[PDB]
Curated annotation (Swiss-Prot):
Its main location: cytoplasm. Catalyzes the NADPH-dependent reduction of a wide variety of carbonyl-containing compounds to their corresponding alcohols. Displays enzymatic activity towards endogenous metabolites such as aromatic and aliphatic aldehydes, ketones, monosacharides, bile acids and xenobiotics substrates. Key enzyme in the polyol pathway, catalyzes reduction of glucose to sorbitol during hyperglycemia. Reduces steroids and their derivatives and prostaglandins. Displays low enzymatic activity toward all-trans-retinal, 9-cis-retinal, and 13-cis-retinal. GO terms for molecular function: aldose reductase (NADPH) activity; all-trans-retinol dehydrogenase (NADP+) activity; allyl-alcohol dehydrogenase activity; electron transfer activity; glyceraldehyde oxidoreductase activity; glycerol dehydrogenase (NADP+) activity; L-glucuronate reductase activity; prostaglandin H2 endoperoxidase reductase activity. The modification N-acetylalanine is found at A2. Monomer. It comes from Homo sapiens. Its EC number is 1.1.1.21, 1.1.1.300, 1.1.1.372, 1.1.1.54. It is found in: Cytoplasm. This is Aldo-keto reductase family 1 member B1. The lineage of its organism: Eukaryota, Metazoa, Chordata, Craniata, Vertebrata.
């Protein structure tokens, strides 16, 4: 299938990107270098991942080597929760640009709808142990994101982990200047997201699926949690197609018109995960994979459930 999807800003976004959350700083430069060498043109980043400098080393080198041109790359980052105030957004974006070695981002996302008190700590706490919100609202943060487009820092802006009412709030914002281009949400066979995906797509917003493999390296994994990569039912579909389970899990969102961003620092898996443009899941395969939904989240945000903008109380 086609390698890129057209966004509502007129730019094209590669449907397969490399994730970088948890990629160790001493391994992510080589991961991104390998990814670019084997065909990746989209890298998903974030300031909170604490490895943008090292991602940037890889990008800048592959540009210097003329393995790729800047206009062929699609680099995404995200505004962290402690930078939602309007006077902090530009500096947060500019720090990410400096670290990534870039003059512009292709896409900049509000990482989560929940703003937190600014300061050095990424999760400022009171007990008492609760995260300290900021009195920022998603609409004013969105206006600050729009400014970044108008200053040339970013080509596109979007949102992440917004529920359908929060997307609707952006779309209904008084004086809205730019619609979100993307909503990046968790999505895989255990969290299939039919309602939120159809809503976003119906509005021309492209959905990116994160944790498509079920994030087996997530730091809070428990043994009793379900495991996509080990699910016999998914392994059977992979065997039928002569592909790996991971390749099925990556192809699945692609056939729903989603972008997908599997993470790896393992060279052989980085290459494997890209070899997903040469086979097709049947409609029956797709419906079968959808049937595995259980509303299970890698990223549940249990410490934020009292935040006024917590996204996961709503059905979707
Ligand atoms: N917007 C948000 O709030 C948000 C939240 C979560 C994630 N994300 C983004 O989405 C990306 C992907 O999600 P994720 O990192 O949570 O998890 P994931 O991509 O679902 O899974 C990554 C894990 O799978 C392993 N793996 C990769 N390819 C494999 C293969 N072919 N066979 C077997 N194991 C394989 C990786 O191991 P190795 O690395 O050791 O190879 C790593 O342990 C993130 O890195 C981040 O960029 C965004
Ligand atoms: O967020 C990601 O991309 C991947 O997870 C992380 C990565 C980090 F480097 C550091 C923390 C997290 C994390 O706890 N996320 C979940 C989260 C964060 C903020 C608010 C909510 C909420 O529920 O409002 C939920």
């Amino acid at each position: 299938m086609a390698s890129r999807i057209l966004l509502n800003n007129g730019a094209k976004m590669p449907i397969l990107g490399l994730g970088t959350w948890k990629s160790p700083p001493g391994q992510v430069t080589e991961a991104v270098k390998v990814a670019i060498d084997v065909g990746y043109r989209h890298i998903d980043c974030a300031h909170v991942y604490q490895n943008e400098n090292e991602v940037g080393v890889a990008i800048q080198e592959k540009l210097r080597e003329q393995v790729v041109k800047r206009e062929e790359l699609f680099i995404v980052s995200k505004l962290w929760c402690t930078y939602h105030e309007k006077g902090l957004v530009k500096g947060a974006c500019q720090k990410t640009l400096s670290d990534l070695k870039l003059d512009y981002l292709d896409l900049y996302l509000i990482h989560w709808p929940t703003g937190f008190k600014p300061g050095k700590e990424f999760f400022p706490l009171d007990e008492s142990g609760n995260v300290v919100p900021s009195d920022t609202n998603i609409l004013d943060t969105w206006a600050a994101m729009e400014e970044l487009v108008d200053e040339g820092l970013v080509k596109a802006i979007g949102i992440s982990n917004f529920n359908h009412l929060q997307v609707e709030m952006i779309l209904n914002k008084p004086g809205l200047k730019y619609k979100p281009a993307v909503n990046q949400i968790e999505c895989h066979p255990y969290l299939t997201q039919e309602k939120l995906i159809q809503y976003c797509q119906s509005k021309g917003i492209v959905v990116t699926a994160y944790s498509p493999l079920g994030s087996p390296d997530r730091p809070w994994a428990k043994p009793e949690d379900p495991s996509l990569l080990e699910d016999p039912r998914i392994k059977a579909i992979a065997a039928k197609h002569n592909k790996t389970t991971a390749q099925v899990l990556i192809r699945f969102p692609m056939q729903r018109n989603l972008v997908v961003i599997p993470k790896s620092v393992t060279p052989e898996r980085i290459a494997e995960n890209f070899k997903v443009f040469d086979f097709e899941l049947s409609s029956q395969d797709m419906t079968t994979l959808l049937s595995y939904n259980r509303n299970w989240r890698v990223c549940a945000g249990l410490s934020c459930t009292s935040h006024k903008d917590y996204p996961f109380h709503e059905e979707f």
